[PDB]
Amino acid sequence: MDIDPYKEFGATVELLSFLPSDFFPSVRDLLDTASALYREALESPEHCSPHHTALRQAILCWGELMTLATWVGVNLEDPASRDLVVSYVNTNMGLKFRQLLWFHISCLTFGRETVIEYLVSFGVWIRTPPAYRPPNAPILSTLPET
Amino acid sequence: MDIDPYKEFGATVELLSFLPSDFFPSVRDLLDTASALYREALESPEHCSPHHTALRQAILCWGELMTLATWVGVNLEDPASRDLVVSYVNTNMGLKFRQLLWFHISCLTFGRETVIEYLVSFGVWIRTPPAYRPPNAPILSTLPETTVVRR
Amino acid sequence: MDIDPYKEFGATVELLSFLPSDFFPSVRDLLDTASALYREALESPEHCSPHHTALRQAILCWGELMTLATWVGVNLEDPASRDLVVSYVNTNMGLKFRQLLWFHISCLTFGRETVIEYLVSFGVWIRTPPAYRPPNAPILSTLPETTVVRR
Amino acid sequence: MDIDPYKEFGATVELLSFLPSDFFPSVRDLLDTASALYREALESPEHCSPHHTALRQAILCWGELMTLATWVGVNLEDPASRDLVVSYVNTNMGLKFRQLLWFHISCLTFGRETVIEYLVSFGVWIRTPPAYRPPNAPILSTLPETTVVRR
Amino acid sequence: MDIDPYKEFGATVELLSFLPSDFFPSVRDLLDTASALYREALESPEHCSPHHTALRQAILCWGELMTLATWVGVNLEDPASRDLVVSYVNTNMGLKFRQLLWFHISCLTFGRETVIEYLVSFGVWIRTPPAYRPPNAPILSTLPETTVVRR
Amino acid sequence: MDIDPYKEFGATVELLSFLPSDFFPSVRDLLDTASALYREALESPEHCSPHHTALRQAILCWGELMTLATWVGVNLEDPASRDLVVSYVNTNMGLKFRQLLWFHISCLTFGRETVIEYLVSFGVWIRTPPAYRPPNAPILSTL
């Protein structure tokens, strides 16, 4: 229907592709983070924020893809076709979920405006020649300076 | 995280299980209705309601499974296993998307409290043994069945 | 140019797509209805509403297809091609004019908001499997359901 | 009773699992730090904070497992089974005590809100693939790295 | 006609001449940066600033050189001439667009006075023999030198 | 990025497509007109209008292609490949520059709204079947 998941939150698909694909954490690390930090708000009857709503849908949509990958294991006899579907789900489909899980978990932790400015800053830093930029890769931190 | 998708919105998976699985329209009919009614609010930069947010996610996850079903048709050589995956996506995985599409499209229309009272009333009707069950099932409508507007 | 004829009027092609083919009266009944009701405003120099403007244009297009269908009868020697073109105009192309004439005649009769909300509620009914819906479709009529005219 | 030890204090076992298991200092280093800093408040008759209460219990349970490890060395004749128990206590059981010692010693220092923001920030850093990961991990400190006090 | 592209903007060809060739990102990185940041203002009907106007024109010139480089691949049979023209466009002509795209993207990001004063101070550094200057060039960045994003 | 060059100025590539490709004056005639009329403002250290900004970029971007066409003459033997590249630059690439120079020189001379109305009027003239098409095509005039 030509829907961009990020633009009600002030970002775009293009702005999350401005960070390298290998930057984003694994789906497992991101689901561990949502569960440790956000679990009781994600399981609550309250809406909380639109990031909570959006993140609840992505956690359930990913769990359905893992039921699919478990199903392709049992119900597909062909080994090469079974391995080729499971790889597509974990690699090609996993990339869009770990951008989406990363974005909402980061906007809950660090704030939405902080994460949108971080995408711009980190993607410009990665494209600068190393002699002309700050030596350390940017990172998000909730821990204050001393 | 267990995460019932409906309890944010005042329902549960068990309340939507009052409806039989064959109650729900096809994903295509529901996508047509979301587009006919809610398309411009679904494409907008604004959060409109949480139903809009929840419905955007479902429409995008479904389009992502159709990319999968198109991919499996191209990239799987074995026809037997190609058809098992394409049928599991369109049938098994489609059932939970057209329950979820039905729920949010019905709450954007009709209101959310109306859809929960509809689920309770439809359950009373479907639990009735067929001998005592009235011919008119409850249905979501903003109109009577016979609408006389005159002018 | 990707123009929707109904979008100007608050409706959509797929909002009207749920009405069945047997829902509509024949083109001839629709033309008789527009003429028995709206004829003097349709033939007037004034713009009356956009429904009048849109309905004048559709009546004139249908008369050009009837000149075509009469021309095809005279100018084609082949019986199989002559009947296959005349059948396509009266049936396939007739269905788009039946739908389009019904819409503007009804928005003049009942009001435009009444016709759009009727199409929302008719679609809920037609998208329901026959087991789960009341056996009578919703009705758009000037008349009471009893159809007894006092006063 | 499931009883997460950390949720009284605003964390969980899953939040402390952002840290790898080899992140944590040895039990000996942590016992030295509790003694260097908190010893007199840990030996006092007063409840100081709940971190003090929780940390006294962990220090006593650990000393009770070291009585076990000393006992097994004396009273088990079989060397093979003696070494399995002493290694399971010092390694497997030691891991959860040095996570718990790290947590309360770090919250007595630095504050508790700082340790939870540190866990969130260290998780962002450790989840980053090593290509994009900055060289300086987040660290708990009350000072800058270069502290110029002059006089 | 002896036009300086930078003179309008408060700079000069020789003010930007001191930046080394390795200073600039590739054209592709510059085009990705302009698109990830400025795209909706670059594609808008409005004049936003003169940097937008100047940057729109340079993006369109570079696309014409990429049509040239693709045309040269197809339409030249000689390998030595085909590679010698494509190398001249991507390297020699690319360096003027790298310099020109860097300048307007930086004046949108950092402000124009910040970029001009950075070029004054970068030139002092680059005109110094390496023995007499600090080993790190001055940096124009949104980020702290530590690159740790709080808030 | 699509980036229609004419969109910030109130036109489109489709609107400038009303004019045939052979309508436009040569690059040399257009650069002579810019130099006679506009040269001191084009060399000014001032934003004058956005048409000045856009026209400075096109004059410089065309001067780079003339360095390329000179470079191909010096640095390429195999005259068949030298002649295909120099003619592609002067003919094929030149068309887009003499549309772009024509547009900004005209909006700068006659006004931008006048040049948009001229495109609409020229399209009416060029769409007219030749029996009813006036012998005088529309032309831009300040006189």
Q: Find the CATH number of the domain harbouring F99.
A: 1.10.4090.10
**Does residue E148 belong to the interface with chain D, where contact is any CB pair within 8 Å?**
yes
Which residues are registered as beta bridge partners of A39? none
- If one counts every other C-beta atom within 10 angstroms of the C-beta of residue C64, the result is 9
- Residues B146 and C139 sit within 8 Å (Cβ to Cβ): yes
CB contact under 8 A, A96 and B61: no
In which element (H, E) is residue F10 found? none
Report chain A's C-alpha Rg in angstroms.
18
Nearest CA in chain A to E135: A131
Dist CA A68 CA A71 (whole Å): 5
Dist CA A139 CA D133 (whole Å): 8
Chains E and F make contact, 3+ CB pairs within 8 Å: yes
Number of domains in chain C: 1
Q: What tokens does D20 get? A: 């790898």
- How long a stretch of residues is chain A? 146
With DSSP H G I counted as helix, E B as strand and the rest as coil, what are the percentages for chain D, rounded to 5? 65, 0, 35
Q: Which residues of E89-104 are buried (b: 16+ CB within 10 A; e: fewer)?
A: beeebbebbbbbbbbb
List chain D gaps (C–N > 2.5 A) by preceding residue.
none
Backbone region of residue B60 per phi and psi (left: phi > 0; alpha: psi in -120 to 50; beta: other values): alpha
**Resolution (Å units):** 2.7
The 8-class DSSP code of residue A47 comes to -
- Technique employed here was cryo-EM
Q: Where are the beta strands (DSSP E) in B1-151?
A: 146-148
Residues of C in contact with B140 (CB under 8 A): 124
**Does residue E35 belong to the interface with chain A, where contact is any CB pair within 8 Å?**
yes
CB contact under 8 A, B85 and A76: yes
- How long a stretch of residues is chain D? 151
- Residues D127 and A22 sit within 8 Å (Cβ to Cβ): no
Domain with C19, as residue range(s), is 1-151
Chains E and D make contact, 3+ CB pairs within 8 Å: yes
- Can you list the pairs that E45-52 forms with residues at least 24 positions away whose Cβ atoms lie under 8 Å? E45/F7, E45/F8, E45/F10, E46/F8, E47/F8, E47/F50, E49/E108, E50/E8, E50/E9, E50/F47, E50/F50, E50/F53, E51/E9, E51/E104, E51/E107, E51/E108, E51/E112, E52/E108, E52/F8
Distance from chain centroid for Cα E5: 12
- CA separation, residue C72 to residues C30, C64, C66 (Å): 24, 12, 10
Dist CA F77 CA F68 (whole Å): 15
Residues of B in contact with C147 (CB under 8 A): none
Which residues does C53 contact at the CB level (< 8 Å), separation at least 6? C47
- CA separation, residue F20 to residues E76, F14, F95, F125, F127 (Å): 29, 12, 11, 12, 11
- Can you list the pairs that F130-135 forms with residues at least 24 positions away whose Cβ atoms lie under 8 Å? none
* Runs of H (alpha helix) within B43-93: 50-75, 79-87
SS3 A4: coil
Shortest CA gap E78–chain A (Å): 35
Q: What tokens does D56 get? A: 């006294």
Which residues does B4 contact at the CB level (< 8 Å), separation at least 6? A43, B12, B13
Dist CA A38 CA A58 (whole Å): 14
Phi, psi of F86 (to 5 degrees): -70, -35
Which residues are registered as beta bridge partners of A140? E149
**Does residue F64 belong to the interface with chain E, where contact is any CB pair within 8 Å?**
yes
Q: What tokens does B104 get? A: 């949010």
Shortest CA gap D6–chain E (Å): 25
